[PDB]
Amino acid sequence: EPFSKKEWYNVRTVGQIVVNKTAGAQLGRVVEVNLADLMENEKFGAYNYKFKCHGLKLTTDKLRSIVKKWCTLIETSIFCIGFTSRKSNQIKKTSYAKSAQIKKIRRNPKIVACSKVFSMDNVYIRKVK
Amino acid sequence: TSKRRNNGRSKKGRGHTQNVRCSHCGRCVPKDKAIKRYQIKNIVEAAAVRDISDNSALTKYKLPKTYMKLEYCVSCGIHGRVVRVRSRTDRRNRL
Amino acid sequence: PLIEVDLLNPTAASEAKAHKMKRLVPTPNSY
Amino acid sequence: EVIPGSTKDAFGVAHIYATFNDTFVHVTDISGKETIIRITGGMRVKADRDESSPYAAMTAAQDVAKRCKDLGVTSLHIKMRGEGGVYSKTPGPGAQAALRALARANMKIGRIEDVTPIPTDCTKRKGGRRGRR
RNA sequence: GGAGUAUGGUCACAAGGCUGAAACUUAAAGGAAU
RNA sequence: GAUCGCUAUAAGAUGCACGAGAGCGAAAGCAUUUUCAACUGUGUCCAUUAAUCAAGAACGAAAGUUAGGGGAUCGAAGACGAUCAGAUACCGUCGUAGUCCUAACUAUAAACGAUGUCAACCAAGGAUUGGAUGAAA
RNA sequence: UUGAAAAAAU
DSSP, X not given: XXXXXXXXXXXXOOOOOEEEOOOOOOOOOEEEEEHHXXXXXXXXXXXXXXXXXXXXXXXXXXXXHTOOTTSOEEEEOOEEEEEBOOOSXXXXXXXXXXXXXXXXXXXXXXXXXXXXXXXXXXXXXXXXX | OOSOSSTTSOOOSOSOOOEEEOTTTOOEEXXXXXXXXXXXXXXXXXXXXXXXXXXXXXXXXXXXXXXXXXXXXXXXXXXXXXXXXXXXXXXXXXX | OOSOOOSSSOOHXXXXXXXXXXXXXXXXXXX | OOOXXXXXXXXXXXXXXXXXXXXXXXXXXXXXXXXXXXXESGGGOSSGGXXXXXXXXXXXXXXXXXXXXXXTEEEEEEEEEOSXXXXXXXXXXXXXXXXXXXXXXXXXXXXXXXOOOOOSSOOOOTTOTTOOO
């Protein structure tokens, strides 16, 4: 029998982790959980947390989604991301920042009010180590 | 002779551009000459989204979508039916 | 241009628009 | 009766790795270090061309459910992935077939996610300048 | 076509680069469009 | 005890998405963040100092050469397995030189806009990169 | 996935 030696433990306690029964329980395990599950609210669903018996990270869905084709991506380092935004009256398709302008921009991110330097909308913290 | 005014690329005031890899062949193709396509697809297809939502462990989960940018060489683009051989007058059309 | 205008006597407004060296008699924009 | 090492309802993580040559249905615990059951598409067919077919992928996705229900696991966090290192980031034909077959067995499906490894800046790709002719 | 070939000169460790013919052969070789 | 999964190590190499008929450069070329050139401005200075250039001289992708370090991935040569009439090829697997850095060579490309450099004139229109100048907060 | 070749002048 393969599972007769297994014992279960506990860690919102968010779940259980199996472990071999002690012999002649070892538990620096890393557990990745969603911030929505921890806070029981779906408004935090776009985040992933790590706990060691640590760090966080934006979900892979959200990071790809917020990348737009005709703007400028700004990154720094705690990792931050940003994108130059459009405007209500703006007509030209592409809203890029100058190189000189970019260097100035380098639980809530309100970082945005840099609104005196350029128009920014998609500001997130995508990772903490 | 000249089948195209831009010679099929999109490079005007530069001399060199980095190569990329055709998504179906792995052929080294220049960045500006590559056939660029952007795909946004749901991870769960329409034929299965009913079952997933049916026995779902969450309350109001909003299913995600993928985002991948594909680049093809010309030979793989035509064969893959991504692009077609247009009419002589329709070549100029750029929409 | 194709719609031809007088060259010897430019209009008062037209010489204000044009480049300082491209006026009929180049004059600066300073004081 | 109650199998030793089994528990009540619990949450697992189902890593589905579907290339165009095979498909893996691998379920672990929440930590990811202990595995409950791992069944590929190859252990379910004879011909090597059917190691990735939807039928093989779906059949392997049924025994995983059966083992999980016996061992107390009732809901899985899906983590879909294809061979997307530098090669095609498109999960193969059995990617959806196994995923649906899991939920078709009254197995609650938690968060779903695409964890295909997207290279930031990669190495060379196999094939050469002129691709695979 | 022979041919960027033979010879002479020169450069390079080398592969080779630069300068560079003739004998002979043949009614076409070629460009864009229908 | 493979494929697979989580967690940590040390090099090498790369610089995705943003990334565009956008920018810079004499051309080759240049993409992780923290000396020179050019455009605009100018009741500033010199006053023909300019243009093109046999000879001559710098820079000149990739490959290649020599000597060290590096040596992850890929891979001229090569070895196998297929397909085939044959396959010394395309297809699959492994793999030496090479692919990276330093120093010295080499000096060629479908090195292309197949379009020499400089100057004058020249129909209509929309859009764009960087200044200047009015309004629009 | 395999498909090589078709004498000279009229």
